Design a protein. Structure first.
Length: 214
């Protein structure tokens, strides 16, 4: 409620970017899809997926028990949601999966571990399966990165975000290892995804996807 409201204040085009992730999954997988949610946190993208796909099986995983406890509370009464404590770097669940989704999590990995993860994700996707990332992305240059930062700050100020939460936000972003969206899209092609695309973008934040065969 307050947490979800705060995420909208901190994330430019939250509805467009998380909404695009939901819409592209809904147009790519069945009603009864098996979906892996990597770095699920409180399960915010999971909640948006459940609203669109009431019959989908969600497996939420994260390295943080504390974050997954928030996801457990959110989905307390949902018998089609499982929770697994697992780092991105730990062995993935067997599969197959119709979709693997992630929001604002994969940027925390070293670049080589991102490329390895994309390869490992495709292995657990059925043919026609989709990988979707709602991601913090780096500008191609230092000058454009400053412009990305100004536009992010403009949203946070316009959204009337508490100064203490924005302060906390900037501190958490120090541990992020973002790269530009086109590099990551090319990495999906390198990983053997036949199609990769940026569906939606608001400067620093982008929704991109890869398809396993289609
Ligand atoms: N190496 C790693 N393996 C697994 N989870 C990781 C991780 N590095 C970061 N995370 C998780 O990634 C999340 C980033 S915050 C995003 C949370 C949620 N997907 C949302 O959109 O709101 C946190 O829950 C953090 O614990």
């Amino acid at each position: 409620s307050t947490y979800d409201a705060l995420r909208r204040q901190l994330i430019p085009s939250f509805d467009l970017l998380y909404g695009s992730a939901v819409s592209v999954v809904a147009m790519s997988v069945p009603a009864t899809a098996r979906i892996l949610d990597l770095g699920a946190g409180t399960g915010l993208l999971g909640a948006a997926l459940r609203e669109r796909l009431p019959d989908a099986e969600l497996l939420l995983q994260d390295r943080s028990q504390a974050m997954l406890e928030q996801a457990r509370q959110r989905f307390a009464d949902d018998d089609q949601v499982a929770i697994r404590v697992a780092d991105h770097l730990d062995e993935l669940p067997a599969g197959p999966f119709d979709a693997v989704v992630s929001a604002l999590s994969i940027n925390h990995l070293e670049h080589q571990d991102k490329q390895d993860l994309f390869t490992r994700i495709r292995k657990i996707l059925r043919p026609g399966g989709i990988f979707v990332n709602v991601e913090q992305v780096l500008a191609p240059t230092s000058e454009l990165e400053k412009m990305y930062d100004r536009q992010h700050e403009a949203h946070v100020l316009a959204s009337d975000t508490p100064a203490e939460e924005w302060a906390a936000g900037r501190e958490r972003m120090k541990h992020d290892i973002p790269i530009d969206v086109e590099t990551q899209i090319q990495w999906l092609r390198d990983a053997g995804f036949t199609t990769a695309d940026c569906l939606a973008k608001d400067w620093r934040f982008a929704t991109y996807a890869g398809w396993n065969g289609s």
